[PDB]
Design a protein around this ligand. Sequence first.
Ligand SMILES: Nc1ncnc2c1ncn2[C@@H]1O[C@H](COP(=O)(O)O)[C@@H](O)[C@H]1O
Ligand SMILES: Nc1ncnc2c1ncn2[C@@H]1O[C@H](COP(=O)(O)O)[C@@H](O)[C@H]1O
Ligand SMILES: Nc1ncnc2c1ncn2[C@@H]1O[C@H](COP(=O)(O)O)[C@@H](O)[C@H]1O
Lengths: 597, 589, 666
Amino acid sequence: QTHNVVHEANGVKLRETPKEFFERQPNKGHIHDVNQYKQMYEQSIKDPQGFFGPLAKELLSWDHDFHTVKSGTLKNGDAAWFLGGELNASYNCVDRHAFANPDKPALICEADDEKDSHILTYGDLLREVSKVAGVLQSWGIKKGDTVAVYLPMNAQAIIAMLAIARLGAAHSVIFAGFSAGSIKDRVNDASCKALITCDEGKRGGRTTNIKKLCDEALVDCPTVEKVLVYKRTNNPEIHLTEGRDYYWDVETAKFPGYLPPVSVNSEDPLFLLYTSGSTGTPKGVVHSTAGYLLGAALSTKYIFDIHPEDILFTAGDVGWITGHTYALYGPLLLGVPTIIFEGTPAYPDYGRFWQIVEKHKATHFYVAPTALRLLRKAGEQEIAKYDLSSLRTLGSVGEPISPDIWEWYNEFVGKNQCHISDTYWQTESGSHLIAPLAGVVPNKPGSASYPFFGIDAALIDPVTGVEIEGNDAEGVLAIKDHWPSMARTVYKNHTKYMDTYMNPYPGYYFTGDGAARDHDGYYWIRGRVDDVVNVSGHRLSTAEIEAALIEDKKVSEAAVVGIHDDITGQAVIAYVALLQVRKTIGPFAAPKSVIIV
Amino acid sequence: QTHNVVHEANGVKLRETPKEFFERQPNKGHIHDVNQYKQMYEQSIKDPQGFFGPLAKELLSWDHDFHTVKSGTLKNGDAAWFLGGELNASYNCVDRHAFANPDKPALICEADDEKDSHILTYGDLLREVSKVAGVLQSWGIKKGDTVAVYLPMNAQAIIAMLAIARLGAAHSVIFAGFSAGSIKDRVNDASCKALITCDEGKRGGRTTNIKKLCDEALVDCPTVEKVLVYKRTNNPEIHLTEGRDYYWDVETAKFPGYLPPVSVNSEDPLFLLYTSTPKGVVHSTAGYLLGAALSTKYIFDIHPEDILFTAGDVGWITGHTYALYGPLLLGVPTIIFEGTPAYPDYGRFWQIVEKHKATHFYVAPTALRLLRKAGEQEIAKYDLSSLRTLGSVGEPISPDIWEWYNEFVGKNQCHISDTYWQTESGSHLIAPLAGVVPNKPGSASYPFFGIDAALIDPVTGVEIEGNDAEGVLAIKDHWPSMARTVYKNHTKYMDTYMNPYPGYYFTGDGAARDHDGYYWIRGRVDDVVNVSGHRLSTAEIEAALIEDKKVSHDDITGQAVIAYVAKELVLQVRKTIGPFAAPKSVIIV
Amino acid sequence: QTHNVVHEANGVKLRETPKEFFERQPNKGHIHDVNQYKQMYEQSIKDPQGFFGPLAKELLSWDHDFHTVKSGTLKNGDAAWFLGGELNASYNCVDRHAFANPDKPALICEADDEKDSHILTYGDLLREVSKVAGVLQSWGIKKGDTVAVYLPMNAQAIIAMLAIARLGAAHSVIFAGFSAGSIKDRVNDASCKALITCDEGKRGGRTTNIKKLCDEALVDCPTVEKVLVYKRTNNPEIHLTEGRDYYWDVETAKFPGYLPPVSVNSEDPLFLLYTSGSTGTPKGVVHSTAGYLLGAALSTKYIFDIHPEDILFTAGDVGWITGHTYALYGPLLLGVPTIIFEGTPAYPDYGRFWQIVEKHKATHFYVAPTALRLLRKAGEQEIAKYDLSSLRTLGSVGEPISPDIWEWYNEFVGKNQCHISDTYWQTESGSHLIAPLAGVVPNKPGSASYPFFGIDAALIDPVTGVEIEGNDAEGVLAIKDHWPSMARTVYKNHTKYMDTYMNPYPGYYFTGDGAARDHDGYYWIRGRVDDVVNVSGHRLSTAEIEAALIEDKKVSEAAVVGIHDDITGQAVIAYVALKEGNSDEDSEGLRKELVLQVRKTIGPFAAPKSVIIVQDLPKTRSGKIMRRILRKVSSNEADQLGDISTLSNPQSVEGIISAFGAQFGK
Ligand SMILES: Nc1ncnc2c1ncn2[C@@H]1O[C@H](COP(=O)(O)O)[C@@H](O)[C@H]1O
Ligand SMILES: Nc1ncnc2c1ncn2[C@@H]1O[C@H](COP(=O)(O)O)[C@@H](O)[C@H]1O
Ligand SMILES: Nc1ncnc2c1ncn2[C@@H]1O[C@H](COP(=O)(O)O)[C@@H](O)[C@H]1O
């Protein structure tokens, strides 16, 4: 009953989900209790064909039926799901709901300034996606191409991603906070034929130089033939290059409000998302179509307990995987409205998150602990001004959540009446790996709890590389078989993919994280074992910051470490031996302080 | 019984279809009587899914089943039909009939000079289409591309169109009477990658300079990579540009008589058709084909044993729908006439009908007016007793011409179908169903399946309830064969059809509805002139006149155009718009 | 009982299949008896829709069902099968077997040197095919493109072909023994965007200069954008051209072990295979996808009696149609292992074939008579060293098999316990046309026996062009309706296709062969009726050889004919006339040079057996060479030339007879 290895586990009472959760639940839950969960879970590991087969047919609409549920192994890096099947990501996210209820809200868009907020119905989204898709089709964008997206977190970003997917092309979303150099690297690696952006961005009332950074990068991007520019501010001083740049509003007006979607194979790439690794240059993580969409829909439904009547607010950016899966693909596949927030939790005041939740009666809130830490510092008193009683599920993502923040999250936001789901996962998993199912799995503050369907989690002895049997254990977190939404390769560098995930511990997938398993099977994430730092939820590479410092002619040696920060979670401190990081990686990746030694 | 608004209807006796019509009918009619028609019609308006769904499966062959019959609205300009479905236009017009009866006639080709006439079976047609499609495929023509066609009304025009559609590309047929400037505009707007044409054309004994005008236009058409040239006259003095121009016979000889068709979506473009700067009217694939087959079957009463003669040019929608797609979809032979009604003599139309025992005749009133003036005596020299349906298209038909049409051509034994429609509707909108709807001479009668016709008060934009009324003709919901956009200019599409009267489709025509529900077309309300059935833009004629450095009613053509400018000036309009659009007389003021 | 025309059939006892054949048979045979065969055959001719429709659904995996089994006619050259259907060749040959049993052997690869041999499972093959397909896809190779393959008979050649087919492209395999000139012709006719080859080849212990000949050809192949090079020897002195050439291992490492296959139409081109005609320029024979695959699976299954437990050894090269159909597509469609042999039957010794069969317990052996004649001459003593008791079906292909060799094959290889399948067919037929079904059709040594499913064979009177009714007859061999695996065209030259196969005898397919039909319906192939030579079972173009000799500026006239060879069946004899030659001793030095010029233009395998130097060739009034005279002189029938006063230079004949006599041996 006492853990000698998992010291976080001693004396931690299980936290049942509050009674108000089930009062607010609009229908009978998708899973009765944890005992039904383990039965379903045991099938997803022992019999994936019988478990995922029906779920894929239930949750997805297919243009061609699949003949094989599961293929490949980790050691060979040839995983595949629903082979032979065809579908379209934008049909499952838009069309099928537009035909059913075209007036149902799809994108609840809360702008940086609330005056600019708006709502797109599923019918509205279909027309806007069709029109943008029509623009790209006339430009020659076809299945197999990649299209870059450099946009803030607003309606246009979602429309761009779905419009690209509508044609069978693969979108590559570049976070709007990246510098011009980072844009150059990602666009060139994928050899994108087109780019979608805007003139300027609004964030916290400040104006972002979006189109300006694109131009600086595009001088070294010979593959980019055309650029679509949305007039977000309509600043007339923004230069467009004749013959290359065209306005979003001008071109979409030329095309009809419906365009047929293009069928793609289950294993055709849906998108590339570039992530910073422990060594070298950022790598383009590739996700399939069917496996990723099933992972997105399945986790959104069961881990958050989403029903058609619900409304999800994921306070994350599509520049990162959190926005891809749980701001766009997850909720739209299920046909529920999703709240797309362009601004910050502090503008105009630290009650923005809560005013939004109250305004739209959101039932699910998904946020990073970094924001929780900041709101506890500057805006705790603002919570009580707003209703917030429509919520029943509160999500945590991107970084470990201390038991302290978990309790504050539960009490001040949840009124001690909501379920909290600390979801562990990463860009390469596509969707959740370990997380407490809402209304099913009791919580231990600071623990991700049980592995999700299809995730056979394990602990490996780092010194011997041998899997650790039994509980009260610690080691590197690894998965024993692949899962539908697992990333399939690194763009045109499958060797880097293998050396990173499949080769370090043959037969397993290597998460790069350490974890612990207590007497009850609950998993406690202990953080990265490589040289990767998660600052404010953003995965950074200490090697990538060191490389930026060395680019300066003054610097000869540079080493980046990590410290504990009560607001940024993890801070990075640079040691240099004889603004550069803000122009190489981006303002968000800047060192906290540079120490000259 | 008394009309105070629709004065055309007063004292107009209903004209039942003659008994000889049903004697000549080869099978029991497709609709028993007007009472079954109204039932079928009322379902097509109240329950389109249950009506068109089954008909789409009956009349068309699908590569992928559709999951939604109908989507979109006019107010949003996002109409779509049979979503998720896949098919191929050339498979439904050729392959499926060639496999069933390869020796059945498909294209009955009557050349300008009868010595050059010939007949292609469905098996022959499949091979010629496959061969041309193979040439284009080897040139890189792929689904999504556009291919221009500048050919007379002969087998090559039909084969080219079906070959382009076989690859999933969209053909853009340019009337062979257009000038080099008009060719340049259409090719560049569509950005065609290839062009199919011939060296010269023969029409009425005259030689037309087809390839010569193409070369003149192609100096300003950078998108055209290759040109396929058919030796219509084999005149050896016609130059081919090395590396761009290739001979039809030489290239088709390199490829096999079967090429797999390419599946396209129900809503993928089938073709562009430019109508008067000119605009490319775009038609979908599945909806357009269903409209063509549905109207051809029920309005004309077409059975497999029948033979259709549409005296129209593929340069216009009439040739697209009722000379090619309509008849071929149903698997019947279609007569493709390259010449004029007067060459070699004014009995040509009737000699053709006799020669091939045609059962259906479809012509424009302008041709009837000409034959009535110059060739009435020739009609009685030919049999013509195989006919039972006589169609009129393109312009209103006077009660006089209706009676002359009925008496001298029909011998008072045929059903007459005055069909109202336009390029953007794809197929018939208002027409008397053969053997079902009694006629009122000069009236198109009842709206067709899926057409919910209405009259709108132009001043208030409010729909007019009740009969004995007049107003702007508008339709209250979209239909399968309705055009979907204007190529790369959807904004003009909306401003022309959907925005003038939101929620309705604006035909640009005024009409009247009498106490029996019959519609009387009263003509255009905008500034478009229909000369001999050709929709012209008076703005386009004025614009051509000003380009010149110097410049700063008809009883046969229906409408003539007179220019007021302040021998050469007529030729200037012939070089900008085309000889067919030339002013009758230019008055210099 | 006595044949007055088919003299090969007189006094020939039927040879029933030995009882040991059925003991070794692993399951119930696919055909009950000869009567069930005749019933199935009669349906395949009278009711093709009802016969091939069901078989097509049984043996092939479809991505889209077909709506029409059969379309078109021969006279119109628009044959088509399974219209509307979609499938992929690499899915039916790899994926569906890998998913079922990924560990089952697929390619049993026996290298030129046995130390380098290896085995790929269907799981391995799926990964290697997926990776190469990924490279080609990233290079822009898409459905409709052609990709050349210039590789030896090993694992990479099979992987290359299947990877190309996986993307919907059409592969054009170029035999590894061709010179740079033959490569240039084939690559340019097809306008290939990419080429897959290796640095060097090993065959019989000898090193072949593959990439070197490849580079030499590519200087005149502007269509080739990129080249994939496999390190067969890893010889570091082999230059790769920057920007065009890339290493197989380097590029394949960048892509994952699964790639979705691309659905193609039943009638989309699967491959081009260039064949020599009486034309001088090679012809790209085009094969469909669905029809060709069904023919391969159907014939492999029923003619050879292949079961999942079996192991097939087709001793043929993918450079020729026999490797395409019966080393690759046939066995892999059925999911059985296939033995891919890179070397020769003589290296390291003349028991190699038998060492391979014994090593892997092969159940089926498929070889050309030329090899049997060589082994009978040089390697009969090697047979007694090996087991060979796992075989039950012995096939012969490519050329006529004499009754003597039939018996030698039967006794020394089959130990008088195997069924022998003399299979008649050709590059353009895709699969077997006339052959004795294993365990079903009794044999007549030297006869192909009965026509196979869907082949309505006929004999046409050469004088009247009228089909011959009744048996004990001889004439032109023709087929009365098209069949699934029939070639569909000649690449971008359908007119040559029609003029060659469909127009000579309207309503029929013209095989180019003469045959005879005896009183039992058995067909006896009598050889080509056009002037085409089969050297070692392979079609050569004497016109193409003449052109190579003339390229040498020493030569002014050249005429090449075929004659009898006791090992290769037919050899080619060149008659050359030089401009100001003379020197009746320097001749030997000139003859040697002329040979080497053909070896560097077409290839060593197509080099003439002997070059005869003459003063002029027999020419007609119009000035055309009378090759019939050269044929008859070269076979010692200088009597039986007839009246030659039709020649413009009859006095030349005497010199032809003396030259051949004096120079043939030397
Ligand atoms: N619930 C969690 N607990 C601990 N760490 C987390 C959690 N969620 C995400 N992470 C970290 O975030 C990384 C993934 O970040 P990213 O690749 O940016 O999505 C993981 O590898 C973890 O280190
Ligand atoms: N039966 C008819 N009666 C009157 N006008 C007609 C009739 N049929 C067609 N039209 C005219 O033809 C025009 C279409 O021309 P086009 O676009 O060239 O086919 C319509 O707008 C009508 O003015
Ligand atoms: N079993 C056989 N008997 C006799 N000749 C054959 C046989 N198989 C193939 N051939 C010959 O090989 C030719 C085909 O050449 P190729 O396709 O190049 O191998 C045929 O036309 C025949 O002349």
